[PDB]
mmCIF file of N, CA and C in Angstrom:
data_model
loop_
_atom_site.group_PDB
_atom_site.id
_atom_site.type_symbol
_atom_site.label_atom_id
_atom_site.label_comp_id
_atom_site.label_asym_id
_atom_site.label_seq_id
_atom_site.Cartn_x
_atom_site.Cartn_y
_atom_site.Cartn_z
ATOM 1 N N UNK H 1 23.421 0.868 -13.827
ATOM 2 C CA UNK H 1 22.727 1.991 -13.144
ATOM 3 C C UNK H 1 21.226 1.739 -13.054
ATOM 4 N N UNK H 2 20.714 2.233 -11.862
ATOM 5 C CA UNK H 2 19.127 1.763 -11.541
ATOM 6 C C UNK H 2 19.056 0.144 -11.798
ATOM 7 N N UNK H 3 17.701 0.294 -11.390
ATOM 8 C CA UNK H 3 16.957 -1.730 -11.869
ATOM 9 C C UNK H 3 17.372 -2.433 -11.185
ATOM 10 N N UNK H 4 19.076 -2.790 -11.126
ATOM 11 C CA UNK H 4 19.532 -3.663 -10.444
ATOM 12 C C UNK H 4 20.084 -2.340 -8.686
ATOM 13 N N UNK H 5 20.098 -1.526 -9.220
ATOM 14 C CA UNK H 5 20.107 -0.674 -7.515
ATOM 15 C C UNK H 5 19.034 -1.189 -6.373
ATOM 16 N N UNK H 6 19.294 -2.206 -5.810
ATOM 17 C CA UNK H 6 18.777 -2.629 -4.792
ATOM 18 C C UNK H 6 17.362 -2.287 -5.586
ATOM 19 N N UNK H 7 16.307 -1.585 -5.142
ATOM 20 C CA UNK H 7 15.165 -1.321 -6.091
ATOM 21 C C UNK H 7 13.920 -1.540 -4.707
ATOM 22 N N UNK H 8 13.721 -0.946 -3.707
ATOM 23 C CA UNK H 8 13.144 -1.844 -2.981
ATOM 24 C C UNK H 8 11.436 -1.004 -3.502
ATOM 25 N N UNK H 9 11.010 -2.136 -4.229
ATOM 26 C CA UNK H 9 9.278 -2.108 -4.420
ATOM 27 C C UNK H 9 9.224 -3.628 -4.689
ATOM 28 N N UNK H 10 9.877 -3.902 -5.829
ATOM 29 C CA UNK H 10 9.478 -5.842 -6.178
ATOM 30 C C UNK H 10 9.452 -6.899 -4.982
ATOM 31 N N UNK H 11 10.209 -6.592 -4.152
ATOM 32 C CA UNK H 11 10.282 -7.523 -2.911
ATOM 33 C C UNK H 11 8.859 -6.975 -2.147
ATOM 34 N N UNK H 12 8.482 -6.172 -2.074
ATOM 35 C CA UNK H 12 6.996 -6.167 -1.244
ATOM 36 C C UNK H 12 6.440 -7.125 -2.400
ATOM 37 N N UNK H 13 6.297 -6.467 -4.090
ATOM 38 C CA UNK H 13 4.827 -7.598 -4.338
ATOM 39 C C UNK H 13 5.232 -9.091 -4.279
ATOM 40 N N UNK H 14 6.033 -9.541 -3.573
ATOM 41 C CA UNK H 14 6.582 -10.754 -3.495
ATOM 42 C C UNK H 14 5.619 -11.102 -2.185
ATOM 43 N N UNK H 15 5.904 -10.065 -1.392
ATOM 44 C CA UNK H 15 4.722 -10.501 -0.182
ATOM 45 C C UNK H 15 3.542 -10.299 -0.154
ATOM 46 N N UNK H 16 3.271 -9.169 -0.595
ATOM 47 C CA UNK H 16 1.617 -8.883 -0.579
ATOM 48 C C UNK H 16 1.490 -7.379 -1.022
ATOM 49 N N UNK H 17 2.247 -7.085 -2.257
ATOM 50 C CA UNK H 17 1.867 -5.707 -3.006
ATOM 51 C C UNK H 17 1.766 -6.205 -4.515
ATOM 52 N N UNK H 18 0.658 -5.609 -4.994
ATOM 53 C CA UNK H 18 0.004 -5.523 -6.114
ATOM 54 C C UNK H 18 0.165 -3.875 -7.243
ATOM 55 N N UNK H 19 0.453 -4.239 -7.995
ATOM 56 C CA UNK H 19 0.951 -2.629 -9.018
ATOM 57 C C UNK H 19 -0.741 -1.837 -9.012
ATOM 58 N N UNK H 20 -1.492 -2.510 -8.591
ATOM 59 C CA UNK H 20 -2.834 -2.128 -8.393
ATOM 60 C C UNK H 20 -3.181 -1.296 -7.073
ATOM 61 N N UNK H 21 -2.384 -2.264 -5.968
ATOM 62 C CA UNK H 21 -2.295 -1.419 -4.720
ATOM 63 C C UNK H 21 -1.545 0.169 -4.804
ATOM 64 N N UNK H 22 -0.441 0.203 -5.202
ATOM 65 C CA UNK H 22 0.285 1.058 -5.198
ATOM 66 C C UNK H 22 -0.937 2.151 -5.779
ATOM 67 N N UNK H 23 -1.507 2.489 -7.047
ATOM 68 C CA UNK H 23 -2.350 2.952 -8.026
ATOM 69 C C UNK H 23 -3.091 3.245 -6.862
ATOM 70 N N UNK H 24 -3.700 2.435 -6.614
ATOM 71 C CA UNK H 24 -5.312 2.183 -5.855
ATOM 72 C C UNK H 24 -4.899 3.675 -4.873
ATOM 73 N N UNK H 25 -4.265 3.356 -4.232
ATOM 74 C CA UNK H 25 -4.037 3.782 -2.862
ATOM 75 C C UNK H 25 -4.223 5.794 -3.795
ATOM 76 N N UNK H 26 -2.908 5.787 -4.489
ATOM 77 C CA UNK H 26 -2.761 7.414 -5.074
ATOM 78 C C UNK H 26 -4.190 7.626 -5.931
ATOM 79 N N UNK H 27 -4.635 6.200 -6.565
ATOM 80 C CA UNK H 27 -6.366 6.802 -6.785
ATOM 81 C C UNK H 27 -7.652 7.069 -5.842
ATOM 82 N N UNK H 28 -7.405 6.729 -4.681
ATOM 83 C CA UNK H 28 -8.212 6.909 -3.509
ATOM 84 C C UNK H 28 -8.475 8.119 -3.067
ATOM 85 N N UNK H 29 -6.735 8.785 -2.903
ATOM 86 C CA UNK H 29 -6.759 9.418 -2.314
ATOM 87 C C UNK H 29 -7.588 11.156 -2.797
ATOM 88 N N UNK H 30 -7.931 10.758 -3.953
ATOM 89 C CA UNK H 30 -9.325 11.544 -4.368
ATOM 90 C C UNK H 30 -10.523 11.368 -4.310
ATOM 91 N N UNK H 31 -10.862 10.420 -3.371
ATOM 92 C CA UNK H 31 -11.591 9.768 -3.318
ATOM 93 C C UNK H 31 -12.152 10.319 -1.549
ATOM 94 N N UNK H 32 -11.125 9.252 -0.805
ATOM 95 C CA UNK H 32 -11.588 9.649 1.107
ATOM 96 C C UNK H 32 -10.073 9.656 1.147
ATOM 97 N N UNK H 33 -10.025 11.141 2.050
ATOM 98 C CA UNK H 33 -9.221 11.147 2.814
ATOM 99 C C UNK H 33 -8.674 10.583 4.039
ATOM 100 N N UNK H 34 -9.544 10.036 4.286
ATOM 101 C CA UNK H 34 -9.563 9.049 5.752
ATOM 102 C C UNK H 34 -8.901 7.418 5.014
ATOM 103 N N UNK H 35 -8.916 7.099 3.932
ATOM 104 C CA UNK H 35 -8.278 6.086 3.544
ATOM 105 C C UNK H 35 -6.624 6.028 3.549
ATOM 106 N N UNK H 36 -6.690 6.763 2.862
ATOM 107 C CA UNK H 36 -5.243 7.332 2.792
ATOM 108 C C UNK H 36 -4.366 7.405 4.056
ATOM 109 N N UNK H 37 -4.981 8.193 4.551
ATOM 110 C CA UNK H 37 -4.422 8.875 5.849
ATOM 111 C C UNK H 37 -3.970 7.831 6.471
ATOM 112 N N UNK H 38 -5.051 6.911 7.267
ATOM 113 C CA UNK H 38 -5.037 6.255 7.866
ATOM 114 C C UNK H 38 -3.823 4.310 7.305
ATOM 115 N N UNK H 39 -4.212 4.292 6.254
ATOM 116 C CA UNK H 39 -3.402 3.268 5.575
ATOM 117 C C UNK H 39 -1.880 3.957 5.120
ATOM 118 N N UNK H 40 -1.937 5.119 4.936
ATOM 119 C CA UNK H 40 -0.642 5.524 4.782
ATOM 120 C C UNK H 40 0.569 5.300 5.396
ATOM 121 N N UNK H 41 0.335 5.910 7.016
ATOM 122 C CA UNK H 41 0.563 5.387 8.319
ATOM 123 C C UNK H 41 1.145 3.476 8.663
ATOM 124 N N UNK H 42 0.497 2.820 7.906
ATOM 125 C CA UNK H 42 0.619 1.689 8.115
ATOM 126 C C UNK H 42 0.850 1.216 6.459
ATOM 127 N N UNK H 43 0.701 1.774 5.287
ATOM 128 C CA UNK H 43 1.544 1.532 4.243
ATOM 129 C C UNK H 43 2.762 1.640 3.688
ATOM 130 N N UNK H 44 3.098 3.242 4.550
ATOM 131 C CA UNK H 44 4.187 3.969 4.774
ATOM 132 C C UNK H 44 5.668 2.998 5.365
ATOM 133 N N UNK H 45 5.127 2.749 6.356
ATOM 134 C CA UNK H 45 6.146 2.010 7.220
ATOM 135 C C UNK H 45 6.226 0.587 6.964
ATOM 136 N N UNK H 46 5.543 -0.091 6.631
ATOM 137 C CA UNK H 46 5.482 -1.426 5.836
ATOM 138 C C UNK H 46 6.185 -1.489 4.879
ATOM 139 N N UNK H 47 5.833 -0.624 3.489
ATOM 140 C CA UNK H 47 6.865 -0.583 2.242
ATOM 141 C C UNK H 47 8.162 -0.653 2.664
ATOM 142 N N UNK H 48 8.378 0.950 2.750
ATOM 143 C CA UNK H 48 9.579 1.281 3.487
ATOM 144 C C UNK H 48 10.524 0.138 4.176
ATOM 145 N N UNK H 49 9.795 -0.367 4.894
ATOM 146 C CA UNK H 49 10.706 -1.343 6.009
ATOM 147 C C UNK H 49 11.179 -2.514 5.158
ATOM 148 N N UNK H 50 12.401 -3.375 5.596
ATOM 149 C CA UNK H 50 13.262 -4.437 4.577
ATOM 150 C C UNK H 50 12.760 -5.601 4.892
ATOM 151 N N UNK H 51 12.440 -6.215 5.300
ATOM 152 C CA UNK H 51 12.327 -7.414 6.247
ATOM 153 C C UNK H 51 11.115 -8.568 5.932
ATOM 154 N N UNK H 52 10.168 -8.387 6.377
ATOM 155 C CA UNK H 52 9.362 -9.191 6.167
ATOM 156 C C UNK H 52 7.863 -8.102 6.726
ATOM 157 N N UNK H 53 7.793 -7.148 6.121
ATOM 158 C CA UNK H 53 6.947 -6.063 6.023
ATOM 159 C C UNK H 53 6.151 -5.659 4.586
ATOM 160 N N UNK H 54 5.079 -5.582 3.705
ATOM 161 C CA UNK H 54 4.917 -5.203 2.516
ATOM 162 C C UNK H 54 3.687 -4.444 2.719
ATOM 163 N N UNK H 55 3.733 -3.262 1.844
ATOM 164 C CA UNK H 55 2.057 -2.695 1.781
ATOM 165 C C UNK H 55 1.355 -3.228 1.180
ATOM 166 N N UNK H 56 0.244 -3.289 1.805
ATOM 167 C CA UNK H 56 -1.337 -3.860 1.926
ATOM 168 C C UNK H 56 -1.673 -3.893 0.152
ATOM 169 N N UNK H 57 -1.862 -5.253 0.164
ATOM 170 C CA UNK H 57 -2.540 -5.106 -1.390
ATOM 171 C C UNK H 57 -4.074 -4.786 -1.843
ATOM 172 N N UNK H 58 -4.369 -4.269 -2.855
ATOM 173 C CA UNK H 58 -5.341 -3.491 -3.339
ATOM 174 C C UNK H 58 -6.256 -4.177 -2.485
ATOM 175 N N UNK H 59 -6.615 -5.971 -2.535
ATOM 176 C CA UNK H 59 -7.767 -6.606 -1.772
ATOM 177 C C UNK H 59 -7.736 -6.582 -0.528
ATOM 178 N N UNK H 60 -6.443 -6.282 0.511
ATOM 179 C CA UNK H 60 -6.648 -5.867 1.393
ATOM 180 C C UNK H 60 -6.927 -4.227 1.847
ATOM 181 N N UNK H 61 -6.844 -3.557 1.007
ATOM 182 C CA UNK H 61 -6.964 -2.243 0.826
ATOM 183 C C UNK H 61 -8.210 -1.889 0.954
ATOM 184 N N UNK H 62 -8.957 -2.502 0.105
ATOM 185 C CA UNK H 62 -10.127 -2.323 -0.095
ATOM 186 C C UNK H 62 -11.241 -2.719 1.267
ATOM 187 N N UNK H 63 -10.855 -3.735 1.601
ATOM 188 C CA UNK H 63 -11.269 -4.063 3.115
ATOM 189 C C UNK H 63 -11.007 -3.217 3.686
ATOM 190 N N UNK H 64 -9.853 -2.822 3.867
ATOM 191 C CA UNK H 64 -9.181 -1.390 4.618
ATOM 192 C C UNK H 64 -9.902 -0.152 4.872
ATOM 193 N N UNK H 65 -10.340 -0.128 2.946
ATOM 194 C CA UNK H 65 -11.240 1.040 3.200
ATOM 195 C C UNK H 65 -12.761 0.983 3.575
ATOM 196 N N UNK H 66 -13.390 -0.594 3.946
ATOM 197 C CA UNK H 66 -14.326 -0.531 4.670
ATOM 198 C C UNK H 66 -14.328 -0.082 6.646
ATOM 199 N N UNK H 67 -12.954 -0.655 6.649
ATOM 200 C CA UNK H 67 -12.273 -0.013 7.774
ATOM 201 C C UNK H 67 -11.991 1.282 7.842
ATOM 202 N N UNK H 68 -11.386 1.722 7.160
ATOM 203 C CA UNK H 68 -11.314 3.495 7.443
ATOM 204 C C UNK H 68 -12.439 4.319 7.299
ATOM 205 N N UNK H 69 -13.071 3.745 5.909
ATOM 206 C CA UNK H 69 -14.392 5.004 5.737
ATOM 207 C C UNK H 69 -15.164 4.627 6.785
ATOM 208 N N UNK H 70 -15.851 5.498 7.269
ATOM 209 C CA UNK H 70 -16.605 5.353 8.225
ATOM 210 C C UNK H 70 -18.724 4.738 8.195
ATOM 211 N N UNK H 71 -19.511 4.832 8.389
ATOM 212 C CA UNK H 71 -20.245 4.261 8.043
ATOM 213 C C UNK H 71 -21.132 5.380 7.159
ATOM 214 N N UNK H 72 -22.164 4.469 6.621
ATOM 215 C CA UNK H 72 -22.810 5.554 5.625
ATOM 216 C C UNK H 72 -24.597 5.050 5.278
#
């Protein structure tokens, strides 16, 4: 029961998710809302998806959020 239930998170950090990303992202989101939002959208459907899809790891995240936040 569980663990071996298919489990789909380990196969993203195989591609490009970090236990940091995952964190990062739910610690952000106290942070800018515009991070979130916007990477969600495109973290959302990445995770989720089986294939050859993974959410954005923390170092791309972080770029991300030079991309989402806006300037300052």
């Amino acid at each position: 029961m569980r663990q071996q239930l298919e489990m789909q998170k380990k196969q993203i950090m195989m591609q490009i998710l970090t236990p940091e990303a995952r964190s990062r992202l739910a610690n952000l989101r106290l942070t800018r809302p515009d991070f979130v939002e916007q990477i969600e959208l495109q973290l959302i459907q990445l995770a989720q998806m089986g294939r050859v899809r993974s959410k954005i790891t923390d170092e791309q995240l972080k770029e991300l959020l030079k991309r989402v936040a806006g300037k300052k």
